[PDB]
Every structure is written in structure tokens, then in C-alpha cells.
Symmetry: D2
Subunit: 363 residues, 4 copies
Amino acid sequence: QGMSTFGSVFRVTTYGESHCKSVGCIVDGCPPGLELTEADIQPQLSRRRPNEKDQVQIQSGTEHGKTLGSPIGMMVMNQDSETDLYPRPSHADWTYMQKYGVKSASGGGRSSARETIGRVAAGAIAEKILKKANNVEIVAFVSSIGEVSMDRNPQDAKFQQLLNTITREEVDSVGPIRCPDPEVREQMVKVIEKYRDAKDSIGGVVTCVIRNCPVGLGEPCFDKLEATLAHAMMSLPATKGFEFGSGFAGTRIPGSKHNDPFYFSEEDQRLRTKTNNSGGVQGGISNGENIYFSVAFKSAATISQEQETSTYDGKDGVLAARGRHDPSVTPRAVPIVESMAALVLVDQLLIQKSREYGKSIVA
Amino acid sequence: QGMSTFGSVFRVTTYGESHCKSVGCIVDGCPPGLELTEADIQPQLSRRRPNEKDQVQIQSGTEHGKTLGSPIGMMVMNQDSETDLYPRPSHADWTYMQKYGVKSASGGGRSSARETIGRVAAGAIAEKILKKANNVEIVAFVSSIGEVSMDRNPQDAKFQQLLNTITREEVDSVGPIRCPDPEVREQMVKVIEKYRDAKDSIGGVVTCVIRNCPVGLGEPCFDKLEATLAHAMMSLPATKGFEFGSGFAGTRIPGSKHNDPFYFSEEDQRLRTKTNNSGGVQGGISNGENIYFSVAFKSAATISQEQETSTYDGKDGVLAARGRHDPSVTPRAVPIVESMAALVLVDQLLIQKSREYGKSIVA
Amino acid sequence: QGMSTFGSVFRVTTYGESHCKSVGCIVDGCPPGLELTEADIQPQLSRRRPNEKDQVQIQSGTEHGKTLGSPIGMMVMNQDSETDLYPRPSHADWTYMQKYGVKSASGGGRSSARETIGRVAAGAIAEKILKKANNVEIVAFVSSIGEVSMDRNPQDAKFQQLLNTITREEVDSVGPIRCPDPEVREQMVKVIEKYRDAKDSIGGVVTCVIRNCPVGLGEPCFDKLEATLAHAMMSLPATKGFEFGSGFAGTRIPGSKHNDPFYFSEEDQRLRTKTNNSGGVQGGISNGENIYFSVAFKSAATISQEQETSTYDGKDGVLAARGRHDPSVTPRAVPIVESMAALVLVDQLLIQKSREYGKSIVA
Amino acid sequence: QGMSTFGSVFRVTTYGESHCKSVGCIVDGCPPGLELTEADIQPQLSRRRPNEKDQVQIQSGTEHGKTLGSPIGMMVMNQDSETDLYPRPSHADWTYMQKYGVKSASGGGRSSARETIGRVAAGAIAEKILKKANNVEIVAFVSSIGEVSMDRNPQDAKFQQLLNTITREEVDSVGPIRCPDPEVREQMVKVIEKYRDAKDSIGGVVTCVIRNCPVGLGEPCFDKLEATLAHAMMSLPATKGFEFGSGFAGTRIPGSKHNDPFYFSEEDQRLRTKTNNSGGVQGGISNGENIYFSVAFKSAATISQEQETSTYDGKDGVLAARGRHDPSVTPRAVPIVESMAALVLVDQLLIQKSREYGKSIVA
Ligand SMILES: [Cl-]
Ligand SMILES: [Cl-]
Ligand SMILES: [Cl-]
Ligand SMILES: [Cl-]
Ligand SMILES: [Cl-]
Ligand SMILES: [Cl-]
């Protein structure tokens, strides 16, 4: 990885702020002959914000709806007293002025959420490739908003059965909260409304599952699958934590119960595991089981409220309430988490298949 | 990053298993003229396991105790019925046979903990550079073992004061548990003994703090500081999760309280933050505040107990108890977490200082 | 480097064919605060082909004519019986069908010269940075066209004095041939006309000089300055060779005469060399002397003539004369060679200055 | 590429000077299950200098003579009035003091030829893989020493027949000159002896051929096959130029004669080319034809003669004759050129085969 480039063999270099001309990316290394038009890319992008404004336009790498193998440029055109007096608390205004000596006049620029358009646009190509590869299914959903949280205990049979069956269509059918639990979601809609009248913001947690992942993906010792996934998710805006499998709470379970015993699958074709506390990754390598992980998103710093903060000139004052912002943007990161997971998987799949070729010729 | 290479400008490529000849690494990009002998590298390595067996030997890149700027090779010499009948549950035996078609005859090989010698050896060079840079202090400690956990609430004043003052000497003075809390540590020594007689294993959580980190470190949008740190920690053996700042529990705090207001430091030289819920990183860039994070380590799969597992031939059987293993290896990852954090920081510091030069000439 | 990405710290990822929507690049790692508009980028682009068709449009990374430090997207909009019967001899038609299984319907696509727009657009930013850095001057010119060649003997005093004084304005004042030698150029215009009536094509050689290059640039052992420059030039379309300094002909000179003795500069500030047979690079590191090199460009495969070739179906036939092409496109590569040299230099300069910082703190 | 790391998927990170403890490398990404012991690696290393001193010792990545897929460490142990008064002319003494502020006390250190041990050790693994892949044959030989040069005209039928048949065994049977031409070699042995009595040094040119290279290798637009090969060869010590195919002299041939027509092979299985002026690469992609290239090596700077040079203190003086050095070291670079070519090819082969998998699933 390097700066605004993600991936090794399937690479995506992104660009763009909010108050510039356009935002997009360049996907390098896509396999040739893949059916690819803007219809394969808009649905995930059109899931980012729920005229059609944010519309992609493929710039290269395709001909007659099929990829050539050359870089694929994609873009969404940019429609776009207190400013620069205080750095907004818990925003990247001050760190940008320290690192770059200059920030965007407003809106935060590159640190904001508009940059993720390149992520989602590239992840749509990766998603289609993984479906052709092994029918990989990547579904994310909101499992927690503030104190209201799903029962995502990895040992709970009901939660594990949800991870095995949850689809992207079901997540979006429950409304904008994108929580598949009806009881928890109703508790969620009451807490986002409470923070809405309070002119506040609240954080959340996104849980995502990867099904039918090919075995053998991951590049120890540093580019392990769960390490590249953590790298991918923790690079998202406002993310504060990442865990997979049994996660943090699994450390309380002894090895006699935490260990995943092996068994030959009931369909009788492969060795599977009885339990999936490992989260589908063992020694940094996928074993074909379900890969599930949760990502913590902090509460939005931009609150519709007054704050006592010091200026850049560093004098104590009151940052006036801007007063126009939604209190829970965590469900808007569900497609970005899905897109980020697909980029990692297709990169590890191509690297591993290169080893599978070499393993076949030196044998 | 790529496979067994970590870093961009300060790069370390590692190698080595347990049952091979040697284990070590090659550090590429170290600044010339740094006082460097094996005495700068052994202490952290000699903290990995608590004749002197694991002794490093610098192979190149130095002359008269000073670095030349060329690659620095370093090594520790390798002193080293049921085997290959079953893949050990929750171990990397099966995934290695699927990805590579072959595993080490025993001991797990590259997936085990011996590979981390290259990490610690390289991290010792990075640690010394960061001390010369801005007197950076990297201290890690065990904050949780199973159900026994420290009160690491990021809003707790006492815990924040511990992160501001805890030293590596104090962590090792409390014994092998490496928990600075005397009440919690005594509860820890009773739970590791309980799992010891039970012939079981238990997981834990390592908390680490970075002090005096230079402002401006981190490379958005993908190589953000907290993203490279998560990548670094989640690539370690047995790690199941990573969080920094307010982490997962911070998502329950509204923005009005979670936001970190700014203020001019009491020593009067810089703009600081009143609270540090951001964890010293904002928009993927360090702001000079304390960087604290916790890493979850699963319970060891190698238990001194019997397990019901299926063979590679995939027939149900009993994996006999090996019966010789310690039930809590989490405190052995404290120096590896410290070494992993130093490698990330020195890489981001060199990249950022290259931008600081360019910022000074185009101005 | 990786596929369509060039550079380490100053990175450029390009994209685009001829028959697609647009062609351009993403420049990652540009220092913030640099005065940058399309006026800094069009002149070199407007030198590629000598309404204004090929006009760049900055997409991001700038605000109020200054760079922010974020990625900089740039683009030129694409205005754009025998086809697919034969692969055109010495073209990339057949290799594309073998590697990708598909080629562009016509025009060669990514293998053609339109891809170099991203190179030139990015090289313009690198050129301006190197001018602010140490007043670096990069001038290229045509020194050979077929059998007509300049007397570019590196030991010739007149040729060395030309390399020390030749400017980009003087190269373009002599006409489209871009050969600074008036006698040789008149011999050149007579040989391109001879091959024009013959409906043929002819190759050439481009010589380029870099002046005021900062000392210390280059990353041994693989990313040496002359190695990155060779990599940069040999990646251009139709290039068949690269040499620098004394080059191939210098191998005939014994070390007693080929060696460059040192001497303290006449301006009295630095140690210089009496002769420059090394070409300004020694051990892969720039010494501040003039860096001069020549690049061989083959004769264009697309000739306005008939050729006997086998089909994809592989039957002997006659490829009809297309009859519309210029016989000498070597002078059109002068700005691309300049742009390619600037990209290498600014990358090595930023890496080296990162080491100069580290050298200053560990001292 | 990065500093002392070469390759993308098949990566080699080298280390080591002359006056250090050891020299070697770490090969990352080797396919598992390859028969590999020191006997596969010593022959090319034992061809570098023609007790057994320079003996490799595999440190990791193998078990029972087969590779595991983990990094492979390899090493050769280091047996090792005028010094530091003058920087030796045309040596890297001065540039090292400017870039690093320090050089090795003597011998040049990392800039010398001892670093190439890691290249040859890694190239031996790549060579064996390419033989299993498509029976790739890499043979290099000395074609020129000073003014004495072979008739390596690419259009000459006899020279092309030599490239098609020359073997590594035949090159070493003619003696240490490693020139397959008996008439030219006898003219070579007379010119190296002339410069030997003169206490001088002379340069040379190494020509290398790659046979049976798989079609489709090369990663446009920057990592084209001939670009990675030029990068690989120009990173070698003392190299001053690189050309492939028709090279520089081919620019004098019009396209009507320079173009390579296609034809279906006489063995009747594939489309081949009648002539090979392209050098087996077209558009940066291998077409399966012979890949031949020449590399220019300058005359050794270390001459057994007196030189007038300025000090580091920069006062005119006489550098005394060291008087112990061989006048023609170009034949010692034949195995290094072969090893360097194998590293490039196996990297491009693995990347391309990853695309061949992706091409097979999206189809
Ligand atoms: Cl890269
Ligand atoms: Cl947006
Ligand atoms: Cl790399
Ligand atoms: Cl160990
Ligand atoms: Cl064009
Ligand atoms: Cl040697």
C-alpha cells in the first residue's frame, strides 16, 4: 500500500475532495473480458447516501461493455464568522494545517466522506469478480447505534445463523437504519431521534460477513487476510476499532471451548470446522468458513450544537451551532465496508492463484 | 506492504521458522550515522520470553557501531502418533496445507511466534530513531486476561494519567504478568493458575501508549496512522481485534461529550486538546497527543488437554493432550506490540519529513 | 513500481486509451502549497503533437491555484477489410490478444502513444518542483534520425558544451525536427523526406541532459538513479535502448582516460569532477554533475506500405497500405523523455531528503 | 521496487557489504514444493569469480529439500597513506559521503560487487522455476571487450543462430573470457593482456538471450518486460547502457525492413514471427520469441596506476597506484546478468498467471 493507493495486484488509486471538480479512482489490474458497465457500479454507489447526482462514468479500460485489462478510470462529478476561526473539535482541520500547512476552505476536503466514492466504485468491480470466482457474498449491516446494540455474541446460534443467511436485499428492506433486528432497530430509531432533538450525534458499529471465500487467501506474515481487512476498515473515516471472529469478547473464553474442531462437511466434499470462533481465518489464511467482523464508527464531530473551543490564534471562544446535520451516519458506511472488503479479497485471491500456478509447475 | 515486507521508506523484510537454521530480518532505509550495536536490540528481544540463547548478531549495514545507510541484516540462530494425523484445532495447520500444500513437520512453522523475532529486532532500531526524533515513548502492558480486565475506560482520569506516566521499567517490575494494576494483577495471577490446573489456555488484551509522537504523521487515505497501526497489530499471531482512542465503547458517547475541544498548552508553545477521545489521531493524522490502543489476543489453541477433532483423512478421533504449555502467553506479546508500533511510526515520520522538505522548497 | 503506477513517494497512476472517454493520471504525494494550474501543465502537453484539443483539466488536489497535498487528478478528453484480419507486424496487436485475450478494435489502444498524456501531465508538476528545489533544468533533443546522427561523442568538448547550455526554447526554435545541430538537421530533413515518398518510417535517438541535479539522489542497490531512469525511458513506446554517460562507446576507453578526476569547483563551494564520463551518477548516486543519456526509438511499425503477413487465422496474405502516417515520430518523444526524467528525479529527491532528516536527528 | 528490494510477487531483498559479517538475501514468494537445496544455488555463485569460500547456506523457507512457501534466507559468510585522502575517481566514495555522510573505511562497501551475491543466490531459484514453467533458457556471454567486439548485428543470420543455440556449458568451455567467438576471443585475450602490462582497465559488453519465454509477460505501461529488464541490468555495478532487439543500430533500418512479419510456426502450433527485430517483446509484452539484449560495462575505476585527483580536503595530489587488479572484469558479470534476467521473468510470469486465472473465471 502507498498513500492513496490500495492493493498489490488488484490496485485502486483514488482521488478527489468535495469542493473540487470530480472524485473517482483508477482501477489497475482488473482481469480482461469481464462484463462491466456503469450498471455494475451505480447500485453500491446509489446505496451510499440513502436528478440522480452521484453517477459514475467509466473513462477507460472497457470496450463494448467488457474490460480490456488496462486501467479503469471512473468518476462522479462534484456538484458542489466561524469558518477558519476555530478548528472544529475532533475534525481533521488542525492536523491538516499542521501536516500540509493548508486545509480546504470548508467541508474538511480529503478527510471527509466524499473520498469514499473511489472506494465504492472500485469495490463494485471487485465484488463482481469474487462472485464469478466462488460466489462470494459480502453483506454488511448496522449492529449497534450508541447504547443500543444487537446481540452479536459469536457463540450465539441465532446470530451465527443470521450471518449465514443475511442478504444485501434484506438489510435494505428494513429502512435506512439497516439493522436486521426488528426489536433492536425500533430501539435504534428511538435513540437517533432522541439525539436529533438534542442536536447531537451518536456513533455505531457495522458488522459484515463474507461467505464462500476461497480457501488459501492471505499473505503472511504482514499481509495476513485479517490484517489487510483491518487496514482497509481502519482507513475509513471515523472508524475507531476493528475486530473479527470472537474478537475482544472471545479472550474471555478458554481454549477448550474457544478452539474450533474440524469435521468433514455434511455435503461431503471438504474439511470444515464445527465452530467458527476463528472467524474464517487461521494463521492469517482463509479456511473457507464465514468471515465476520465488526467496525466501530465514532459519533460525528459535526454537531448541530455550540462548543467551547480555542481558535487557531488559540483564544477561548464559542463555536456556533451549524445546525443542519443528521445524528447517525453509521448506516451510510455499510456499502463502504462491503466495498472495502471486496477490494482486499480480490487482491488476496489473485496473489494466491499466482502461487497456485507456481505450485502446479514446480510439482 | 508486501507479504513478509513491512514499511515504505523504513522497510523490514523478515524470514525464518522454528525448525530452520536461523530467524531474522533485513532493515532497509535506516538513517546513516546512528549508534547501533547488538546492545540496542537485545533488551527488547530479551523481553520476548520472560546460556543466553536468543542473541542477535548484526550482519551488515554498520561499521564501528554506526549505521552506513545500507541494509541491516540481523539474526537469531535457531537452537531447535498424533503429528500430522489431525490438524490442531484453531491452528494454521490445515490452512497451510490448503494454501501451500505442505506445512512444517511440527510446531506450525512460519505461523508460530518465532517469526516475531524479526519484528522485535527491527523495532529496536525504529525505537531508537524515534527517541532521537522527538523523545517518543512507546510503552505496552497487559490490561486484561480473560474475564479479569483493567478499568481502561478512556474517559477515566486515573487510566489517562497512567497512560501519561507508565514506563517500560515499571511494567516489567510487577513480574511476568506485566499488568501495572496491583489489585487487577492479583486477580490475574489467580485466573491463570485456575486455567493452569484445568490444563487450559486463556486470552488477553494488551494496551499500548505512544507519547511525544510528532504531529503530521499518517498518509491518507489508505495509509492513515491508525490504519497502519491496525495493520501492524492485526498481523501479529493470535490477534483478534484492534481499537484505539475511545474505541468500541466510545460509540456510546454523544458528540457533545465525545468531541475533543482545543486549547493552547499550559507550557505555552502549541495548540493541544482538552480530552483525547480521538486517541492522538484525527483524520488519519497524528496531532501530537497520546496515542493509545488495545489489541485482543485469543486464547492459545495449543492446550494441554484432549480434543475431539477430525483427521486430515477426516475421521472423528481424539487429539491426545500434549501437556506442557503455559496457559497465558499474552504478556509475551507486550514487546512485540511495542516493536510493531515503532516500525509504523518511523516509517510515517520519514514520509512526512519528506513532505516537510517539499513544503519548504515550493513555498 | 506496479503496472500503471510509477514512483515511490511522488507517485503517478495513469489510465486511458485512444478510443475511450478520457486519458489522464492521478499524482499522489505532491508537496502542498505549490502554485499549480493548468498553465503549468499545458506547455509540455502542447509540445507532444507539434480548437486546442488536448487540454488538461485539474480534477482535485488544488484550491486557489495551490496544491493541498491530496491526490491530483488530471485529464485530457478523448475527441476520438483489414482490421482484425492480420496483427500489424511489430505492433502489440498479437501480444495483447495472447495476454488479455482481447485488443482494442483499432488503434492499438493502451499500447499506443496516447497513454503518455498521463506521463507528461504528471511530469509537468515534477518539473516545477525540481526547479524550486535546485533550479534543475531538463532539456531533451533529437540527436539521430536513421543514419543521420549528431556527433554526440561524450568526450567531444563541443558536444559537452552543448549539453551544458542547451535550453528547451532553443530546441523548439529550430523547427519540428528538434535537432540543435543545423548541419545535421538539414541532413535529417532530407532523409525523412526520402522515407516519406518511399511510404516508409525511420527511427531515431533522443538525447537528454539534466543540469543542477541535487547530490545524493538514487536508492541502491536496485533503485539506483540510472536504473530508475532506464526503467522510465524503456517503458516508453517504441524505445529499444538506453545508455548514459560514456554509454556503450565508453567501454572502448581505458580506465586511465575514462576515469573522472575530482577538483574543487572554480566558483569555490564544492568538489566537482574534471570530466563527466560517469554521466553525473556514480555508484547509482548523483554527484551534481550533468546527467546526460540517449534513448533509441525504433522505426514506426505503422507504415504507409504493403506488407506480407499471416492472419490471426494464420494464412499468408497482404496487409494493405493504410497510407496516412508521418515517417519520423521520434521528435514527438522529446517532451515525454523530459517528463519521464522529472518524475524519477522528484521521487529520488523526496526519498533522499527523508534520509537527510533522519541523518540530522540521529547525529 | 524499493531500495534493496526487487520484484513484486517474487520478491528478493538483499543485504551485505564486503567488510561486514555476511552477505545474502531473503526470497519472498517462492512457490511451495520446489526441490531446493544449496546445490541449486552454488553453481551460478561458483561462476561469479572464475577452501571453497563463497558457499551459500539456506536459512529458512525449506524443509526436506523442498520449499514451504515462506521467505527463504540465504547467505555467504564474509571471509574479509592514501585511504580516505582522495575519493577514488569514478568510484562511489564521494557520492556515499555526500548522500550518507559516511562510507566504508575501504573497498567501497555496498557499491562494490559483493552485493551481487544476493542477486545470484535469488536468481538461481528463479532460474529453476522458469525451467519447470516453460523450459526457459537464459544464457549470457561476453560479446565485446574494448574495441574488440563480436559481430552482434541482429539481422546477421549467423549471430541469430548463435542466440538460438548457445548454452551456458559452451560459454564456460572457452575459458574465462566467456566469448563464444574463437577468432574474436583470441583478439580479446590480446587486448586484455595489453591493458594488463599498461596497468590499466578496459570495459566490455555482455549479450544475453532468453529462450522459450512464455507469451504474455510484462505489465504495461511502466512495468513492461523490457523496462523491468533494463531496470534490472542498469542497477548492476558499472553498467552504462542497455539495449534489446535491434537496439540503437536498429533505428537506421526502415520500417519496411525492420518490421517483423507473422507466420504460423513450422512445428504447427502457434503464430510466430519471421524476423525478431522486436527482440521477443512487443508493446512491452513477450511474444514467445527469443529475447536478446546487450549490457555495457564500463572500464573498472580501480586501476593499478597513478592518478592526479583532488582530496576530500580538495587539494591537488597524486593517488598512488594500488597495483593488484585484473584489467577486465566484464566476464565476471555474465552469471549476474543471467540471474538478474531470471528474477524479472519469474515475477512477470506469476503476475501474468494471476491474470490468466482471473481471465478464466470472469469469462
Ligand atoms: Cl505500490
Ligand atoms: Cl458525499
Ligand atoms: Cl514493496
Ligand atoms: Cl520462540
Ligand atoms: Cl495522441
Ligand atoms: Cl566479491
